[PDB]
Homo-oligomer: A and B are copies of this chain.
Amino acid sequence: APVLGILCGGGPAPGLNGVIAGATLYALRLGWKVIGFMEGFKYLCTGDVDVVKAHTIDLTYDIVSRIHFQGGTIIQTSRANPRKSPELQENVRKCLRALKVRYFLTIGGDDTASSAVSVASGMNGNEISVISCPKTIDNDLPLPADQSTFGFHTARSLGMEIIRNLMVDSKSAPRWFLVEAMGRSAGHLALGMAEASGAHLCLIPEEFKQDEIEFEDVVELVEATILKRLAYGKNYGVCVLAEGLVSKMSKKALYKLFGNREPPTDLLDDAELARSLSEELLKRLGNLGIRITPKKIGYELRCADPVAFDAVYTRELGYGAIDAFLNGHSAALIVRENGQVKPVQFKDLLDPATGRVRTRLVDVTSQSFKVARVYMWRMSKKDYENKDLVARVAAAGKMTPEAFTEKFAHLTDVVVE
């Protein structure tokens, strides 16, 4: 019987086991033998077939029959990448031929899919067929607008529940939380958690008009929201910050971000966006009775058990991968569009300028973004022109109306309105 081998690459997202089980169960009904490589390409890169065998398992019915309930991945994952070296690509081809892998399914992000196609491009199309399922919790695949990537619904819903606890705690014991949503690629996750939880502010890189963000502008955007709520008798709230703000900051802004220090270098992971903003804002607003606390939301989302939407999603994706194998497809990506799972050739999704799959960002001109903005607390252009409002907010910050306009009014040209 033909051999299907499956591996996972990149950082996990809820529903990985759903894809493994959808593909495995269907393949077993077809009579296929299914094996799973542990930790992605890590051991296939060595080329030693004995080492690979020690880190491959038989994906049987009993193993996968109920993993659709479970977050994580039973075959683990790694960022080991064979595409960088032609020796590594040939080591992967050597082990795949030794195991008689007829069908090769990878579940991972762009780097994982590119590794799978590079292994196939130097391999006979009759002995091996390669299919990849695009993975990302960030919702940044170029699907039709409003259609989600798998795992995003689970991450957003758990993020809403965590922020709910922080909303009740900030009101019960007046304080501001600056929640930092991990993920620098796009603002879908930060804005989704914020809108669902009714957070009082959300800042994503997509809403900044200029190409480079300044540290001062971010501080003042949060400062204005705190003062406006304070003018309405509320010295507490929650502000959600997409970590992608850091990757859009200028060189000078990053210098201030790291404590007026030289930014580390080989390193945006060492940055503490929420922490730095909390310190600066306490300098400016602590005298007003405002306390501010940072809080990161990230790793606890990646392996939460999938919600029903993602369970159905990944079951259909696993099926579609096997169907693509049956219909002779190769070097294709299994995506779901308009309720239909279908294979799409890797190059059809690539952005020519980058060489990787195109990144779908938050559309800040859409009506959905304007609706989310409506339920946030913030000073719009019209608000700065409302003199009664400006007088109350300035007085809340213990400053003259002219000083408030002098400091904050320019922010209407920093972010879309």
In the complex, what residues of B have CB within 8 A of residue A29's CB?
A: 374
Interface residues of A in 282-318 (CB under 8 A from B): 293, 295-296, 299-304, 307-309, 311-312, 315-316
Are A296 and B299 within 8 A (Cβ)? Answer: no
Q: Given A165-B304, A367-B340, decide whether A312 and B172 contact each other with a Cβ distance below 8 A.
A: no
Task: Confirm or deny: A339 has a beta carbon within 8 angstroms of a beta carbon on chain B.
Answer: yes
Selected contact of A339 from candidates B65, B165, B195, B368, CB within 8 Å: B368
Q: Interface of chain A, helix or strand or loop or mixed?
A: helix
Selected contact of A153 from candidates B296, B309, B372, CB within 8 Å: B309
Task: Confirm or deny: A185 has a beta carbon within 8 angstroms of a beta carbon on chain B.
Answer: no
Are A171 and B338 within 8 A (Cβ)? Answer: no
Task: Confirm or deny: A92 has a beta carbon within 8 angstroms of a beta carbon on chain B.
Answer: no
Tallying the copies of this chain within the complex gives: 4
Interface residues of A in 64-94 (CB under 8 A from B): 65-66, 68-73, 76-78
Complex Cα gap A372–B315 (Å): 8
Complex Cα gap A77–B291 (Å): 14
Are B303 and A192 within 8 A (Cβ)? Answer: no
Task: Confirm or deny: A193 has a beta carbon within 8 angstroms of a beta carbon on chain B.
Answer: yes
Name the residue of chain B whose CB is nearest to the CB of A340: B367
Task: Confirm or deny: A169 has a beta carbon within 8 angstroms of a beta carbon on chain B.
Answer: yes
Are B366 and A339 within 8 A (Cβ)? Answer: yes
Interface residues of A in 92-145 (CB under 8 A from B): 144-145
In the complex, what residues of B have CB within 8 A of residue A164's CB?
A: 69
Complex Cα gap A17–B26 (Å): 30
Q: Determine which residue in A29, A66, A172, A367 has the highest number of CB atoms from chain B within 10 A of its CB, and name it.
A: A172
Q: Given A146-B338, A338-B146, decide whether A303 and B169 contact each other with a Cβ distance below 8 A.
A: yes
Q: Determine which residue in A192, A299, A304 has the highest number of CB atoms from chain B within 10 A of its CB, and name it.
A: A299
Name the residue of chain B whose CB is nearest to the CB of A74: B172
Interface residues of A in 366-387 (CB under 8 A from B): 366-368, 371-372, 374-375
Interface residues of A in 171-212 (CB under 8 A from B): 171-174, 177, 192-193, 195-198
Are B304 and A171 within 8 A (Cβ)? Answer: no
Are A72 and B300 within 8 A (Cβ)? Answer: no
**Which of the 9-residue segments A154-162, A250-258, A347-355, A400-408 touches chain B?**
A154-162
CB distance from A376 to the nearest CB of B (A): 11
Write 10 A-B pairs (CB below 8 A) sorted by A numbering. Answer: A39-B174, A71-B168, A72-B168, A72-B169, A160-B308, A169-B300, A196-B312, A295-B296, A315-B371, A319-B371
Residues of A within 8 A of B (CB): 11-12, 16, 22, 25-26, 29, 39, 65-66, 68-73, 76-78, 144-146, 153, 156-157, 159-160, 162, 164-169, 171-174, 177, 192-193, 195-198, 293, 295-296, 299-304, 307-309, 311-312, 315-316, 319, 338-341, 366-368, 371-372, 374-375
